[PDB]
Enzyme design. Structure first.
Site, PDB file in Angstrom:
ATOM      1  N   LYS A   1       0.860  -1.210   0.000  1.00 21.78           N
ATOM      2  CA  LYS A   1       0.000   0.000   0.000  1.00 21.78           C
ATOM      3  C   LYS A   1       0.887   1.247   0.000  1.00 21.78           C
ATOM      4  O   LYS A   1       0.538   2.227  -0.673  1.00 21.78           O
ATOM      5  CB  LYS A   1      -0.951   0.001   1.199  1.00 21.78           C
ATOM      6  CG  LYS A   1      -2.032  -1.075   1.147  1.00 21.78           C
ATOM      7  CD  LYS A   1      -3.261  -0.692   0.345  1.00 21.78           C
ATOM      8  CE  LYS A   1      -4.214  -1.858   0.129  1.00 21.78           C
ATOM      9  NZ  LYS A   1      -5.435  -1.461  -0.614  1.00 21.78           N
TER      10      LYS A   1
ATOM     11  N   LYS B   1      -2.710 -10.715  -7.598  1.00 21.54           N
ATOM     12  CA  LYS B   1      -4.039 -10.867  -6.960  1.00 21.54           C
ATOM     13  C   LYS B   1      -5.040  -9.932  -7.645  1.00 21.54           C
ATOM     14  O   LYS B   1      -4.683  -8.763  -7.953  1.00 21.54           O
ATOM     15  CB  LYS B   1      -3.973 -10.525  -5.465  1.00 21.54           C
ATOM     16  CG  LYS B   1      -5.295 -10.690  -4.727  1.00 21.54           C
ATOM     17  CD  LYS B   1      -5.270 -10.468  -3.223  1.00 21.54           C
ATOM     18  CE  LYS B   1      -5.217  -9.018  -2.800  1.00 21.54           C
ATOM     19  NZ  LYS B   1      -6.483  -8.307  -3.109  1.00 21.54           N
TER      20      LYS B   1
ATOM     21  N   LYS C   1      -9.633  -4.906  -5.672  1.00 22.74           N
ATOM     22  CA  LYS C   1     -10.931  -4.198  -5.757  1.00 22.74           C
ATOM     23  C   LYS C   1     -10.701  -2.714  -6.075  1.00 22.74           C
ATOM     24  O   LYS C   1     -11.712  -1.988  -6.170  1.00 22.74           O
ATOM     25  CB  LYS C   1     -11.762  -4.440  -4.495  1.00 22.74           C
ATOM     26  CG  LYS C   1     -11.227  -3.848  -3.203  1.00 22.74           C
ATOM     27  CD  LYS C   1     -12.230  -3.958  -2.077  1.00 22.74           C
ATOM     28  CE  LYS C   1     -11.624  -3.635  -0.727  1.00 22.74           C
ATOM     29  NZ  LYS C   1     -11.339  -2.183  -0.568  1.00 22.74           N
TER      30      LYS C   1
HETATM   31  N1  LIG Z   1      -8.290 -11.703  -5.044  1.00 17.55           N
HETATM   32  C1  LIG Z   1      -8.751 -12.188  -3.884  1.00 17.55           C
HETATM   33  N2  LIG Z   1      -9.017 -13.509  -3.798  1.00 17.55           N
HETATM   34  C2  LIG Z   1      -9.572 -13.981  -2.679  1.00 17.55           C
HETATM   35  N3  LIG Z   1      -9.914 -13.318  -1.568  1.00 17.55           N
HETATM   36  C3  LIG Z   1      -9.641 -12.017  -1.679  1.00 17.55           C
HETATM   37  C4  LIG Z   1      -9.063 -11.382  -2.767  1.00 17.55           C
HETATM   38  N4  LIG Z   1      -8.891 -10.030  -2.511  1.00 17.55           N
HETATM   39  C5  LIG Z   1      -9.364  -9.881  -1.296  1.00 17.55           C
HETATM   40  N5  LIG Z   1      -9.834 -11.037  -0.734  1.00 17.55           N
HETATM   41  C6  LIG Z   1     -10.476 -11.196   0.569  1.00 17.55           C
HETATM   42  O1  LIG Z   1     -11.658 -10.417   0.584  1.00 17.55           O
HETATM   43  C7  LIG Z   1     -11.930 -10.006   1.950  1.00 17.55           C
HETATM   44  C8  LIG Z   1     -12.235  -8.528   1.977  1.00 17.55           C
HETATM   45  O2  LIG Z   1     -11.076  -7.810   1.517  1.00 17.55           O
HETATM   46  P1  LIG Z   1     -10.851  -6.295   2.001  1.00 17.55           P
HETATM   47  O3  LIG Z   1      -9.708  -5.786   1.197  1.00 17.55           O
HETATM   48  O4  LIG Z   1     -12.147  -5.612   1.967  1.00 17.55           O
HETATM   49  O5  LIG Z   1     -10.621  -6.482   3.603  1.00 17.55           O
HETATM   50  C9  LIG Z   1      -9.447  -6.717   4.223  1.00 17.55           C
HETATM   51  O6  LIG Z   1      -8.440  -6.849   3.587  1.00 17.55           O
HETATM   52  C10 LIG Z   1      -9.519  -6.862   5.733  1.00 17.55           C
HETATM   53  N6  LIG Z   1      -8.300  -6.257   6.335  1.00 17.55           N
HETATM   54  C11 LIG Z   1     -10.779  -6.258   6.350  1.00 17.55           C
HETATM   55  C12 LIG Z   1     -10.847  -6.468   7.829  1.00 17.55           C
HETATM   56  C13 LIG Z   1     -10.746  -5.529   8.812  1.00 17.55           C
HETATM   57  N7  LIG Z   1     -10.870  -6.116  10.040  1.00 17.55           N
HETATM   58  C14 LIG Z   1     -11.054  -7.466   9.875  1.00 17.55           C
HETATM   59  C15 LIG Z   1     -11.226  -8.479  10.807  1.00 17.55           C
HETATM   60  C16 LIG Z   1     -11.383  -9.779  10.349  1.00 17.55           C
HETATM   61  C17 LIG Z   1     -11.371 -10.056   8.990  1.00 17.55           C
HETATM   62  C18 LIG Z   1     -11.203  -9.040   8.061  1.00 17.55           C
HETATM   63  C19 LIG Z   1     -11.043  -7.727   8.494  1.00 17.55           C
HETATM   64  C20 LIG Z   1     -10.734 -10.460   2.788  1.00 17.55           C
HETATM   65  O7  LIG Z   1     -11.011 -11.670   3.498  1.00 17.55           O
HETATM   66  C21 LIG Z   1      -9.645 -10.697   1.739  1.00 17.55           C
HETATM   67  O8  LIG Z   1      -8.714 -11.676   2.174  1.00 17.55           O
END
Ligand SMILES: Nc1ncnc2c1ncn2[C@@H]1O[C@H](COP(=O)(O)OC(=O)[C@@H](N)Cc2c[nH]c3ccccc23)[C@@H](O)[C@H]1O
Ligand SMILES: Nc1ncnc2c1c(-c1ccc(Oc3ccccc3)cc1)nn2C1CCNCC1
Ligand SMILES: O=c1[nH]c2cc(Cl)ccc2o1
Lengths: 333, 321
Positions: A112, A194, A197
């Site tokens: 990031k 990867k 989003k």
């Molecule tokens: N290309 C991909 N292939 C498979 N899985 C993927 C891909 N890109 C993203 N993910 C998964 O999507 C979830 C949400 O991603 P975020 O970026 O919103 O969200 C995140 O990256 C977290 N930090 C948000 C968060 C904040 N507090 C938490 C506590 C528990 C669990 C999660 C969170 C995630 O599970 C992420 O692993």
């Protein structure tokens, strides 16, 4: 009482088929088996600079997308992170039980920081501590995430163990729940990266709210390989694009990779992409139909946020009171 | 009426330098300013300490501020952890603070020790604070709070007041090192007189106070050449209100033993009244509980107004009560 599931997603960018297969799919499937709590993590979202109107709209878009995927507010707790002050309160306390070096070594902070060199903020650095607070507040047993969040989850386990070793059984030690298929869906034009989003090249992604006609065109232009003859076979090192297409197909249909490889024997990438396009287009058409019914019902979205914050606050206040008693704070009257 | 914010760190026994040097004067300005005293227990835990000692030190600090004359009906006094808005604004302000700013303020230090300047900025900015009385060790920290306020205001409008240091400043120096200010955070406890010390302890510490080898002994003010005698005179003047020239006349032909005897008697006379009030307040659990409840309610009402304006500016969906 059932074991507890907790997980979150950011109301930034536009959630993709990657977010769905690595996370949301498991969230929907866990709702009867476990006591599930799902969070829209708006406080994490702002570690990347957001437009205020986009962030508010994206928070409500994300809530309606949870409901459209099948997250049921009669079975699960659904809430917005900033509505529960205990997240920030426990986050500060856990900063004091986290080492600088545990944060500086994080892959997400490094990636990031390289992408946003003009906004390397302390929130971006401190991201994993707030996420450990999010999980530990709810006595969480299982955290369904994609593979990219494994390093963050491992720190939350270390924080829980370190705190418990000093103060007693205050936290549960959470375990990751990472799926066998779709844990790391890759970009359609760069299958070594990867799926993001927030990709500047929209042709790399399958957005959950994207026009299915647009998505089918992106699938047909997805990169494969130079194999002669073309052969549908899973091999991430030598056939990253074909492998990624098989992983998406398996994840949507429930069919195993060996079953897919047998189905495609004697066929080439036209049959593979035709089946991926048909399966994804059908899933997104049904998902988007449910989405607009929830997204345009502001009274229902308002009620879900109110009831969810009330349920979350009950759990979170209990944990924070025990944390504050353990560390030696004068309890609030 | 300007808003003044002070963070009272629970650990460390206040000294006569803390009282006669600042708190005594601030007690007399409670009608001039809206003064806020925040007992900063969330700042305390950046350093590992015994939990029961931190709880006791929080209540010790509250009772001592009340004993010195902070009026919970005129001023707002409360415990930081009782007001969730401090941690809530702190997280938000992390997102508007450069990592570089905290680095310029290792793998084994806790993140709280790296990040507390952001919590201090939140503590101040929550209350639309105009003035912060800071020590020299905190000037860079206040500058960061002003930088964060201006940065946020430039994006979102006039959400925060930009706080200013309280510029205007009794001199109380260390008894065995009269070139060093007397400090509540000192390891050589023989350098300080704590506000709770008994007359026998005060006599013992004053008697060891460093003087000079002038022959004959002469009680005259001279910081360069007579640092120890000058310090004893400054302490005596700060207690009694008598001028340095008046005291010099009073001690003509007198030895340093006479000066030390009068300093100890004057200091213990001032502390007896403080100590009576302190033990009375400190042992009244219901009084302390009601001060903390009233203070947190006043602070939260003000802090919630600022936090709501911050959350609206950022774009968060408003909580559903
Ligand atoms: N290309 C991909 N292939 C498979 N899985 C993927 C891909 N890109 C993203 N993910 C998964 O999507 C979830 C949400 O991603 P975020 O970026 O919103 O969200 C995140 O990256 C977290 N930090 C948000 C968060 C904040 N507090 C938490 C506590 C528990 C669990 C999660 C969170 C995630 O599970 C992420 O692993
Ligand atoms: N928490 C800490 N942990 C380690 N070191 C710290 C601090 C703080 C600190 C503590 C409380 C605090 O409260 C306020 C809040 C608002 C207004 C006034 C005071 C502010 C700062 N200061 N320092 C020192 C160490 C040596 N001198 C340089 C910095
Ligand atoms: O996780 C975190 N880090 C934090 C830093 C501040 Cl200043 C406040 C709350 C926090 O929660």
């Amino acid at each position: 009482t059932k074991p507890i599931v907790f997980s979150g997603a950011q109301p930034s960018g536009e959630l993709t088929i990657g977010n769905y297969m690595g996370a949301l799919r498991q969230w929907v499937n866990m709702q009867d088996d476990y006591h599930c709590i799902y969070c829209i993590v708006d406080q994490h979202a702002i570690t990347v600079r957001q437009d205020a109107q986009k962030l508010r709209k994206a928070t409500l878009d994300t809530l309606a997308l949870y409901l459209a995927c099948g997250i049921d507010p009669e079975k699960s707790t659904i809430f917005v992170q900033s509505h529960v002050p205990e997240h920030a309160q426990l986050g500060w306390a856990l900063n004091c039980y986290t080492y600088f070096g545990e944060l500086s070594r994080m892959t997400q902070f490094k990636d990031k920081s390289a992408r946003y060199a003009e906004n390397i903020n302390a929130g971006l650095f401190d991201y994993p501590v707030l996420m450990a607070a999010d999980i530990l507040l709810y006595q969480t047993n299982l955290v369904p995430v994609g593979e990219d969040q494994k390093q963050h989850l491992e720190l939350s386990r270390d924080i829980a163990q370190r705190f418990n070793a000093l103060y007693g059984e205050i936290f549960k030690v959470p375990e990751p729940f990472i799926p066998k298929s779709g844990a790391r869906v890759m970009s359609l034009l760069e299958p070594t990266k990867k799926m993001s989003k927030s990709d500047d090249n929209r042709n790399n992604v399958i957005g959950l709210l994207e026009d299915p006609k647009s998505v089918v065109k992106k699938i047909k232009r997805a990169v494969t390989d130079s194999d002669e003859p073309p052969v549908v076979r899973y091999d991430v090192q030598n056939k990253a694009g074909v492998s990624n297409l098989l992983d998406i197909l398996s994840a949507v249909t429930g069919q195993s990779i060996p079953e897919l490889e047998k189905q495609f024997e004697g066929k080439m990438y036209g049959h593979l992409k035709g089946e991926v396009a048909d399966a994804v287009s059908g899933m997104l058409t049904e998902l988007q139909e449910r989405y607009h019914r929830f997204r345009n019902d502001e009274a229902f979205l308002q009620q879900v946020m109110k009831d969810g914050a009330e349920k979350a606050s009950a759990h979170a206040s209990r944990t924070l009171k025990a944390v504050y008693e353990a560390i030696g704070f004068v309890a609030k009257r």
